[PDB]
Design a protein around this nucleic acid. Sequence first.
RNA 1: GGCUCGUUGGUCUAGGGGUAUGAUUCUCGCUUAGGGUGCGAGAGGUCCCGGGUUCAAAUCCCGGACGAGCC
Length: 55
Amino acid sequence: ATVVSGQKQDRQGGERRRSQLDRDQCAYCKEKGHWAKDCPKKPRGPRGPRPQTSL
RNA sequence: GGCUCGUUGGUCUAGGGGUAUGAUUCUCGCUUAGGGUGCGAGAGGUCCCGGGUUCAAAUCCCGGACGAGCC
Ligand SMILES: [Zn+2]
């Protein structure tokens, strides 16, 4: 006789840790009026070695 | 042994140099008995990360060990 590995355990679903979105919201923090590319939660503010307002 | 680690708005595509191209997707109209199929419009990308190079280069060239940090 011969036998080999197979099958998988039971699984579930309902979401992807994302919820509803729109082109006016942010993917990183879920706020509105901006996108992740400009998110205020990122280390690219409020101060750094490039103020971008005096240079 | 303990603690922290929310960037889903494309993906795939060749890369003998231009942010893009090609294949597919989502929404709506028209088409159809019908969410289908085709066509048009709208939703679409500084295409591994950092550094170097002539206007412009994933594999142009170069580095990249078991995920990382703290106690
Ligand atoms: Zn944000």
